[PDB]
């Protein structure tokens, strides 16, 4: 399955694939080190993962 990247917001890049004609499959989230410390990236995920779980298909384990 071919992957592609989208910008969720500046510095935050999600890698997606097609899945079952519904939500795209989330493969990874990349945080620009120009814009994010590791602490800020972990805070971003804590703040945004709820939305991410609903907008995308996210394997939980």
């Amino acid at each position: 399955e071919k992957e592609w990247v989208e910008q969720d917001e500046p510095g935050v890049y999600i890698t997606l694939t097609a899945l079952a004609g519904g939500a795209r499959d989330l493969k990874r989230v990349r945080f620009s080190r120009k814009r994010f410390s590791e602490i800020q990236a972990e805070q971003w995920w804590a703040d945004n993962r709820g939305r991410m779980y609903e907008q995308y298909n996210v394997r939980m384990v």
Partner: peptide
């Protein structure tokens, strides 16, 4: 669960 990967110098990666 998702894992943080911190070995790249350009991006922090959360690998699902």
């Amino acid at each position: 669960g998702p894992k943080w990967v911190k070995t790249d110098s350009d991006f922090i990666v959360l690998e699902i």
